[PDB]
Amino acid sequence: DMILTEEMQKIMNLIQDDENNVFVTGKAGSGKTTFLKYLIEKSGKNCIVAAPTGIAAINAGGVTLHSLFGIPFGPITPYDRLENKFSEYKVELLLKMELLIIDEISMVRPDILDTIDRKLRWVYESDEPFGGVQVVMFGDLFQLPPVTKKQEREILSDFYDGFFFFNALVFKRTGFHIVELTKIFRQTEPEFINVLNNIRNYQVTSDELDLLSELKDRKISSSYDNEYIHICTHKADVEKINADKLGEQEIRNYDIVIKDKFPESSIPCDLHLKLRVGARVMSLVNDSLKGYYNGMLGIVTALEDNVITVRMDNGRTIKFERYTWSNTQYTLKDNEIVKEEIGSCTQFPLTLAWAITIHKSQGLTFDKIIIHVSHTFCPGQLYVALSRCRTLEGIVSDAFITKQMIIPEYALIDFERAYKSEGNYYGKRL
Ligand SMILES: Nc1ncnc2c1ncn2[C@@H]1O[C@H](COP(=O)(O)OP(=O)(O)O)[C@@H](O)[C@H]1O
Ligand code: ALF
Numbered sequence: 001d002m003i004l005t006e007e008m009q010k011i012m013n014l015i016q017d018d019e020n021n022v023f024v025t026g027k028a029g030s031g032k033t034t035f036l037k038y039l040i041e042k043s044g045k046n047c048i049v050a051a052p053t054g055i056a057a058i059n060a061g062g063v064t065l066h067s068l069f070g071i072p073f074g075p076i077t078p079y080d081r082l083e084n085k086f087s088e089y090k091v092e093l094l095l096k097m098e099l100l101i102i103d104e105i106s107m108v109r110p111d112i113l114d115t116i117d118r119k120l121r122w123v124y125e126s127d128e129p130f131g132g133v134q135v136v137m138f139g140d141l142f143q144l145p146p147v148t149k150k151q152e153r154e155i156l157s158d159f160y161d162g163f164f165f166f167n168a169l170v171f172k173r174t175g176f177h178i179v180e181l182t183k184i185f186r187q188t189e190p191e192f193i194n195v196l197n198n199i200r201n202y203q204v205t206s207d208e209l210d211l212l213s214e215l216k217d218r219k220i221s222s223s224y225d226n227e228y229i230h231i232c233t234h235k236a237d238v239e240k241i242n243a244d245k246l247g248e249q250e251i252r253n254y255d256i257v258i259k260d261k262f263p264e265s266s267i268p269c270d271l272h273l274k275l276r277v278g279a280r281v282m283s284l285v286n287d288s289l290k291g292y293y294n295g296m297l298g299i300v301t302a303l304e305d306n307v308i309t310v311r312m313d314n315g316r317t318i319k320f321e322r323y324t325w326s327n328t329q330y331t332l333k334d335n336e337i338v339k340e341e342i343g344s345c346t347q348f349p350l351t352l353a354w355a356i357t358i359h360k361s362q363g364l365t366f367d368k369i370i371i372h373v374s375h376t377f378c379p380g381q382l383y384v385a386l387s388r389c390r391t392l393e394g395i396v397s398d399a400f401i402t403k404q405m406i407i408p409e410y411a412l413i414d415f416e417r418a419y420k421s422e423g424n425y426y427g428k429r430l
Contacts, residue, residue, distance in 0.1 A: 003185075008035050011179050012042060015099075019430055021135045021174060023105065023166075026181030027196075027387065028363045032138050035181065036060065036101065039136065045098040046337040048330055052107040054266025058325055060103045061339075064266075065112060068330075069119050075152045076111045077159050078169065084122055093330055094123045096337055097133055105137035105165050107145055111156055113168035129174040137165070137176070141412055142200050142387075143362055144380050162411050166426055175427020178419045186365070192392045200383045201416075202408035211392070212401045220396045221370050227313055228396060229282075229297065229366050230355035231388050233374040233381070238360075242352040251276045252303050260343035262327050269325070269347040275300050281310060282353035285323050292318055295364040297353055308348055313367065323349040358384055365390050373398040379409040 008031070014020045026032055040047045049062030050069075057064045065071060070086060086094075100116075102108065117130050124131030148156075148163050160167050184193070195211065198204050204212075220226060224245055232238050254273040269284060283296040292312065301317065302309035308320045327343040358381070369389045374381070382405050389395045419426045 002034060002038065003183075004038075005031075005181070005183055007179055007181050007183070008038070011035070011039070014177050014179070015039075015043065015134065015136060018098075018134050021137075021176035023137045023176050023178045023426070024181065025139065025141050025178065027140060027142075027184065027193075028365050029184045029186050030181035031183065031185060032140075032181060033060070036103065036138055039101070043099055045134070046096050047099040047101055048093075048097045048337060049101045049103060051103040052109075052112065053104070054263050055268050056104045056107070058266050058268050058327065061328065062101070062103065063329055064263075065102070065108070065116065069116050071112060071115050071119075075109070075155045076115050077155065078114065082115065082118060082122075084119065086119075086123065089331070091123055093332060093337065094120065096332060096335060100130070100133050100135050102135065102137045103139065105139040106141055106143055107139070108165045109145070109148065109152075109156075109163060110160055110165055110168035113165060114170055117168070117170040129170045135176070140363070141416070142380060142383060142409070144378070144384055144409075164411060164415070166415055171427035173428055175425055175429055178424045178426060187390055189391050192390075195392065196383060196387060199386065199406055200380065200408070201413055202406065202410075204403070204406060209403060215371075215392075215395050215397045216400050217396045221372075221398050224354055226368075227297070228368040228370045228394075229280075229353060230370045230372060231358060231361060231385055232355055232372045233358055235357050235359075237372070238355040238357050241355040245354045246274060246276060246279060246352060249276065254348060257322075257346040258343070259345070260327075262343040262345050266327065267345055269323075269345065269349065270351050273348055273350065275303060275308060275350070275352075277301060277303060279352060280354045281350045282356070283312075283320075284349040284351060290318055291316060295361075295366065297366070308350060310350070320348050320350055322346050358388075361388055364388065366394070367391075368394040369396070371395065371397045371401075373401070373405070377405045377407050379407040380412075382406055 011022055011024055014022050049060055050065045051057040051060055051062060052065050054064055120131035120133055126132055195208050198208055230241055251274050256269060256271050277300055279300040281298055281300055283292045284294060286293045296312055298310035298312040300308060301311050306321060309317060310320055311317045324344050324346045326341050328339040329342050330337055331340050366388055367390055371385045386395060
């Protein structure tokens with residue numbers, strides 16, 4: 001069923017040359033996850049998939065960067081000394097890795113990449129960056145990174161020109177090609193995409209500005225019974241909203257089931273799923289054959305012991321059973337990198353969805369959203385909240401969206417401008 005686009009093939013063309021590192025970027029719904037899987041199968045290489053957080057690793061079927069490379073937590077300057085206490089099997093695993101795939105690369109502080117480059121050089125006893133391991137990075141540039149602690153910020157400041165992954169010092173020694181996936185498979189909305197590009201590039205016209213002014217509506221934005229999902233900055237506001245609407249009447253509780261070794265921070269579901277008939281909910285996984293995807297909304301119609309029946313917004317009724325997330329780790333089998341399960345957790349793939357945070361809805365899109373203007377805006381945070389919808393028309397705002405709420409991220413605009421001018425390549429050329 002998959003389409004192989006020209007941009008996808010162009011990435012495959014680049015990684016044939018084992019010396020090419022590649023940054024694959026694109027908005028939500030542009031096929032990043034789907035193409036990552038195809039990339040693994042067609043690469044012809046022993047791949048390891050890693051991500052900066054536990055939930056992202058679980059979702060992409062890989063491991064966290066910190067566990068894979070024994071990275072200590074906290075900022076790391078070039079001259080902090082690394083213990084390098086790799087077990088023998090980890091060393092042999094890393095020595096067979098020909099292709100490192102890092103998902104959600106925009107969440108990766110640049111010192112983590114340099115620490116990875118340093119550990120691999122130690123393991124390969126090599127001066128080549130990343131010990132010569134080819135690196136392919138997936139993520140959306142313009143999704144804001146985790147706010148770097150004040151401590152972290154000024155330690156790394158003495159060594160780093162900025163706090164994005166591409167500020168890693170290793171990129172003064174190697175570089176990477178960039179390919180953007182621009183086909184949004186779910187829908188094709190040129191005007192909305194154009195507004196979004198103009199907001200993030202700080203090139204908004206006065207038309208777009210009032211196009212943005214219209215999105216306000218105090219009636220809809222204060223209602224919680226309308227298939228609009230409330231998108232809020234703060235987790236506390238979202239907890240209150242989903243608790244208020246859930247209420248205390250006729251609530252059933254379903255407990256997560258853990259088997260063996262599962263990191264607490266990697267758990268991708270509710271620990272205690274509290275629901276009730278009529279509760280607004282969101283699907284957390286994709287199962288194409290039962291016809292639900294990560295992000296789909298619905299209303300709870302029936303509650304049983306092993307089955308929650310939900311009427312999705314598209315008119316369908318689905319019988320949700322418990323889903324099992326597998327905690328995997330990589331290993332060798334006749335010098336070939338394979339996976340092995342070391343634990344799992346099991347739970348219905350549903351969560352309360354009258355509201356959701358910006359953070360929890362990263363990489364997701366909805367038909368209808370309500371933006372709770374969160375005054376004291378930051379850089380990019382308006383673009384991020386509008387990016388959670390599929391059209392301009394499904395967006396309703398708390399208050400009026402004003403020009404001063406558009407806070408650009410000039411480091412990202414300069415990065416794009418720089419690579420698009422130098423042949424879709426950043427860093428040192430070999
Ligand atoms: N190459 C492709 N061909 C056809 N459909 C695709 C392709 N890539 C993605 N899709 C569809 O678009 C949706 C988004 O895919 P996904 O890989 O999750 O995008 P991203 O990871 O960039 O958010 C999926 O539900 C999938 O059905
Ligand atoms: F894996 Al994605 F959006 F990056 F689903």
